[PDB]
Amino acid sequence: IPIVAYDIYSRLLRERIVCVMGPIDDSVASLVIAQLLFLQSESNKKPIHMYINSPGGVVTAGLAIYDTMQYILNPICTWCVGQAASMGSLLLAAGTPGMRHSLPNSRIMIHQPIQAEEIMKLKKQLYNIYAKHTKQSLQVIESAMERDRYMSPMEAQEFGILDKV
Amino acid sequence: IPIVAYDIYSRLLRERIVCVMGPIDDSVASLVIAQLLFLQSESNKKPIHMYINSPGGVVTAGLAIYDTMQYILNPICTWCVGQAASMGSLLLAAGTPGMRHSLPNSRIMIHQPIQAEEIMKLKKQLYNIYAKHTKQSLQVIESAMERDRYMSPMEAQEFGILDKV
Amino acid sequence: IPIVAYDIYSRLLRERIVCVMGPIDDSVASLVIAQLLFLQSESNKKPIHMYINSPGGVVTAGLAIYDTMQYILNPICTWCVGQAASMGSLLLAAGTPGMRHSLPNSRIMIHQPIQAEEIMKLKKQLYNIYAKHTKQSLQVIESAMERDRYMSPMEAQEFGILDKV
Amino acid sequence: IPIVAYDIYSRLLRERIVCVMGPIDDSVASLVIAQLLFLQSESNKKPIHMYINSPGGVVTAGLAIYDTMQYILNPICTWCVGQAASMGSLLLAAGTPGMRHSLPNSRIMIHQPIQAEEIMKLKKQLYNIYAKHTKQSLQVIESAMERDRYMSPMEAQEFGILDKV
């Protein structure tokens, strides 16, 4: 990792930029939550920018990150570079309305590649969040989350996951 | 871990914030106890904030941390992000009255997933602590600690683990 | 890695030089994207220089890097040292017209050494990008991408991958 | 493995019974093909019985086994015990008409959990085989092979994979 004593990621964070790359798990979630809290303490009015390039991850960590993004008062812009699959698509769709962007050669997946009841409760939570942020019906979300396929930025724009491309 | 020579966790600790993430064991307990002691030596009147995202851990380490939190004179606020299960739920319920908070998509579990007598003594200790801090009866605690299930923040509010959500 | 507290790569980055060496995967793609973004934030008018010595990599990471290079407003010069094979040949051909260079003893390969449909979509994307940047027909690209062989800088000049050697 | 110098599987093979259990790969395919050839050499008029309990496998091995079953002149009965998923469902549906059976608590899956073109040719081969043996249209097969779900013996009976249950 090249340096600028700052690293490249710390130099980027000086510009209020959080990078969510690679699989999402508990350590990544903790680091992202800490970065968001630090950025909010620096200022609660300035926008934040998130760049997503992720193959997916765990449901609990993604839900924690989503809750933290919805808690703070700053506007948040989300940009898809490369991949946004499974949990990354939730974060991409959870940005501020009018501030969700993608690059022309990006793929978006909302299909998902403890006991038997907690998994059902978490899945229903995901359905409700997706329906709230996409403005679809619940049945449409359950039907779409079952097919194993990717989407282009124009398809995701028609669905309701993105605003511009 | 991005830096700010401070790291992100040290930058947070400058704001009097202790982070309890991941499984709780002896090393984590020692680090948390040292951080709490240093924070108290800095000042014995200012509040402290703890953020919990934990799947559980060992009983001895959790009891040590609970004793240290009850020893110092500072008020302590507890915030649940993500998960609070097994030993993390004890720490969540052990905060100062009126200062126990949770996020809307959080799951709370009080069920627990040497010789034969020390284990029973530690379990009775846990029952007594839970009954003291939750204001339930002992029989209710023993019955609830046997079912394998999670709780929503509203259920934990009705039980007595939280104050607000 | 010799130092100059700067390293040799950081000293080179001070001169606006990005080095793409070794196989291309998600970590390399993330580092290169971050470096390009930081360089653009430093200035959006100054040229950038990229040096490629790569045996290939993953399609998604190469597409992400290609999209980032096409997004920023700076002119980009590409220089082949050693090898440019598979994904590295896309980056070599994607530079600014008139600013694509190679050394006399370099080998260039465009042959490539999830479900069954996403692979077809990514391959058609590659065909379209290659045809756009090389000025060949699509059939020529699909025919050439099937033979297992390397090319000299003069053959790559005749094809359309390079501008000078 | 209990013995009867014969083992239990050899004692079963004395009754003209071939067992296809566990994941299907090249070694399993070779053993099954050799057993079928030996059984045919013993007699080319007597029926054979196959018991399938398999989570899936490789396409090439399943196609080889299917071709061998279609080559020999003996009638073949197929019985599903437990699981028949991915490649096992092809073998289950490829039995002699009127001789395809399942147990009441069995799950059947036809969704599938080299270069880019050979995979597509093999997929089209699978579509044609499934449409021939199930009596569906090709579009129905491609639509059904995309959803990630299992089937009950009554659903598989309505589809055309089974004859009785």
Place this chain on the structure above:
Amino acid sequence: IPIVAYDIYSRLLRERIVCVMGPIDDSVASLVIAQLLFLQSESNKKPIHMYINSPGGVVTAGLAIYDTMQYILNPICTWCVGQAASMGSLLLAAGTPGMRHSLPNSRIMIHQPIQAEEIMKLKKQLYNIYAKHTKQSLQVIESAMERDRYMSPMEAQEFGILDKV
């Protein structure tokens, strides 16, 4: 491996059947050569049957097996089940004229997935053998051995690798 004290492969060898499955290397070549020598010593007039299901292997072992098949006086029939790629396609094409067979769902590949001169001499040897047994020209063989693709039994019939399907 089920038994019949004979195994299934030894029971098959009682019927004058040699099985060439899996990758071809020195141990496999030695076993196949020993089996062919033993079969010839049993009788030098009776036919032999070979079944090929192989992804490829080493050139030296395949050349040794080819030489042994060409040495003995028995007629040899070759049957493709599943795969015949790289070195296995040489063995498939090297059978007795009029006795080279394949199954309808089989894939045949003749492309190939010490010092610098011995490799070239072995390649020229392969070109000469292929041209002799297929009745093509040398230039056609060199051109075809460069494209990375598989063939159907009808294409291999038109080329000259098979006699019937």
Place this chain on the structure above:
Amino acid sequence: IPIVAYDIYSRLLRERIVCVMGPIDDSVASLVIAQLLFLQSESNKKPIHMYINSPGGVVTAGLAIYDTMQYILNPICTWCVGQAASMGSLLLAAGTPGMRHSLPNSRIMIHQPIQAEEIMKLKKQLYNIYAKHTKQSLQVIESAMERDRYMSPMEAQEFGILDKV
């Protein structure tokens, strides 16, 4: 380990605090002895504070630490947090009279979970040290050192291991 260039443990050592956590072995003993020597060289009149959370360790290392504690002229206070078992209980009982403290939920164990004569000699040494510092008789010590059980701070107060709780 969070920093304050000081670490948290070095920041604590600035306050004259030595932390004895985890199993006690030769490396831990050497570090603790060096810290005690450095603290004495800083001043030979100021008190020192030790915090013990230990499951036990080796007899030789504990004896070395005990000897170093008894050598220096500074008063030493011992505080039990969590666990004090086997060798940790020796260190807890070896503090200055009137300066041995414990937390309400702490467990204390004195039972212990080369040739045959050195082990017995070291055991007699332990018996003599315990009898000297606890004010029991030798027979009481050997009887209590045999039962496999833990003690509460009130039982340890009655025995003579602690002064306050």
Place this chain on the structure above:
Amino acid sequence: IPIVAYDIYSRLLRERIVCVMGPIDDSVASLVIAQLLFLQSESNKKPIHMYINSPGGVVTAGLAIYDTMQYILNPICTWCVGQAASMGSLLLAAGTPGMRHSLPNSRIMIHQPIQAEEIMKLKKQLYNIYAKHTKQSLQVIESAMERDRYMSPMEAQEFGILDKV
């Protein structure tokens, strides 16, 4: 290894056939020497046949095998299948005059791919053996033993390693 209770190699040994395949080391040398001794004890007048397919090995084991071959009174025929390199070429050339054979697609190499003096003595021993059995001069042998290349059966016929091909 298929069986005939005899194995294929034991069935071959019934026909007075010794197989020298794979790298030659101490275990292989011991097995071959024991087989040759047993064959001589069975009869001291009947011929023996050896088939060589070997990439090379250790000098001491090859010298032991050569000495055992020269000791017994039986005629020995040597046949090259596949490869005869380094130590295998010594065994190939050490057969009875007029009884050294090779297959048309075989490669023969005589170049070789403790203290500093024993290695020189062993090399001079090899030079003397080669010159004796090939009828070349010592200088020719030392010159030829230095070039890194293989030979065809006609070249080895001209040199003196073989009698027929």
Place this chain on the structure above:
Amino acid sequence: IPIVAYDIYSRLLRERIVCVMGPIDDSVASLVIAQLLFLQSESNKKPIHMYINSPGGVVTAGLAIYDTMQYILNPICTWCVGQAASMGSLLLAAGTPGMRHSLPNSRIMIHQPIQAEEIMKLKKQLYNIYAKHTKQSLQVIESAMERDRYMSPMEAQEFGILDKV
């Protein structure tokens, strides 16, 4: 590695000295190329010194380093310490005329201890480079590249690899 915050290698690089020690592969080639580029950017008129102690490496990395050395405008002196074998001998011979030096006890070897055609093209490239820089004929180079032996500095002086010793 002793320091002077500079290391010993960085302190040497301050004197315009590049050290090529150990086997040459892609990482070493990238580091050496970056160092040469940085040195040229510091000044394009001052000489550079390279010390070679290398057993060999990969052809592609050595060709990349050779091309970079021939590209820059600075004079380059090459010094052999210890070993210069295989790829290192190319770098030793590729220095500026009159500036190629060796130590009295050094050994130089030019013998060399993808598909079948690319290796031949790379070998012919090596032959042409060696003939250009040594002033031998191509046949002499091909003959000398086959013998497995080392050379003394006087022999390499007579050949044309060195200028002084």
Place this chain on the structure above:
Amino acid sequence: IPIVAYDIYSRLLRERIVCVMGPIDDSVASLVIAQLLFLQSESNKKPIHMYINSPGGVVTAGLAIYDTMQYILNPICTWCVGQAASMGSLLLAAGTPGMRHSLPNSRIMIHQPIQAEEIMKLKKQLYNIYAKHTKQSLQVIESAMERDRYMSPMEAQEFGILDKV
């Protein structure tokens, strides 16, 4: 290891203190020799203090350390904490007369838990050193070095290894 940028061991070395802990081998010997040389270069009149807690080690390293201690002109004090066994007892006894100290609970062992003659020469060297520094006869040393037992500081004082305790 806690810091004071100095570490605890470097802070101790500022007070002219060398710590010999753990097994003694070549790396430990080299570090100790370098520290002693640096301390002598700082001053050749000031005393040095060594603290020994060691289970033993290799004879050659201990002899090297002993020779270095006897070479320099500074007085040296030796202090036993914990253990001094095998090679550590040599270092303990090799200090300046009147400056060899031990703690009350320390154990001292002089029994020791290439070709056949070098071991005997090294043993005779050890006997001579021990007899010189302890003032015993050689026969007493050889008799005592055979029994497998430890000693108390009073026994070691009577023997001649220590001066005070």
Place this chain on the structure above:
Amino acid sequence: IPIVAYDIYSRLLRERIVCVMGPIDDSVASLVIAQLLFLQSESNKKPIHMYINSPGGVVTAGLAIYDTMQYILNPICTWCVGQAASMGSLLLAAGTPGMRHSLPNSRIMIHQPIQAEEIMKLKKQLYNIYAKHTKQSLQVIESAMERDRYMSPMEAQEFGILDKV
């Protein structure tokens, strides 16, 4: 290991032949001793033949085997094939006078490549055995056992290790 239900080694043992190949350690010694005891129980008048191809081993195992050979009443012939080094040379020289043989290309070494006194006693035992069986003086044996070199059968004949070659 080829079979004859007998193996090749058991078939050889039927002819009263013991094979000592590979390094000599405790397991090999136990097997050889058991074989010699069984052979003696079969008959105490018939000769036994031993074949040695060994690089050496442990002194205790070789001494045990030597003692067992000297105990039984049968004549023993020793034959060197390949190597007889270190412990194997003792066994070779310990055969019955007039019955010690070697092959022309064999190397013999008598140099040898607990506490410090037992090694001396075992070495003196070896010297005495060698002097007894070779008819040299002790000083000659100790001088010869120090040089690192091998011997030819003629040198070993002159020394006294062999009787014929």
Place this chain on the structure above:
Amino acid sequence: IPIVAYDIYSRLLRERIVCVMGPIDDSVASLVIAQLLFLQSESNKKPIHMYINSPGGVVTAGLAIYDTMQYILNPICTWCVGQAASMGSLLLAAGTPGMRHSLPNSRIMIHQPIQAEEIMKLKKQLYNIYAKHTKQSLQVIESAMERDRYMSPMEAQEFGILDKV
């Protein structure tokens, strides 16, 4: 292990011979005890022969074997070949009076290379057994079991461990 379907050890056991070779642990003890029980059930009047070549082992297993030997009614002869150290010397001395033999080049050791009290009880048990079977005094046994040295058969004869040599 050569066979005679019997192995060499089973063939020896047919002659009433038990072999105790290698380290003695629980598995070896169980096998030896089972063999002794089987031999006694075959006949309770016939002698048994034991051959010892052992470096030592665990005290509990040796005591179990000693008890079993003392329980059965058969006479037992013990023969030392090679080594009898630690636990093996107990078994050697525990044979029937007048039936304890050794070979001339054998070494015998009686020095020995849970809680602290059980080890002492087991040691006192060993002292009593040794004094009973050797006819020494207890003090002599304790003194002799401390020196680290081996014994010759004549020394063991004088001590009382053997009867003849």
Place this chain on the structure above:
Amino acid sequence: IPIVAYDIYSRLLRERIVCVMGPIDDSVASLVIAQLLFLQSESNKKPIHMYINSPGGVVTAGLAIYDTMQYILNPICTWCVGQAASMGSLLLAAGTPGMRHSLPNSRIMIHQPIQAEEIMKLKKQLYNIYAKHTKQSLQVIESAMERDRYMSPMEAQEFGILDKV
């Protein structure tokens, strides 16, 4: 490694001291050569001191170091501490005349514990260097380099390896 930001080795290098400890291989040789070059560039008139404690190493690295020491113009003093064996004895003897020292308890060994000709040429090189620097005859060097033994400083003084002790 204790620090003084300098380490102990860098602090020593400030005094013009190079430490050659442990086995000598290519990395150690490169570091030593770089240190010697840096020291010469600092000054070409001041003396340098080397301390050797080495068990040996590789011939090529030792020859490279020897050549570098003979190249520079500074006087060099060599001091033996501990061991100087194999390649380290060459470095010890290669110092400036009158400046070769050893400690009283040091052992010196000159015996030494690719193809077959390069090893012999390197050995002859070693013989010539040793004879030049020791003033012995070549035959004496070859005879002495064969015996496996060490030397005392007085023996090495008589030989010619040292000047004082």
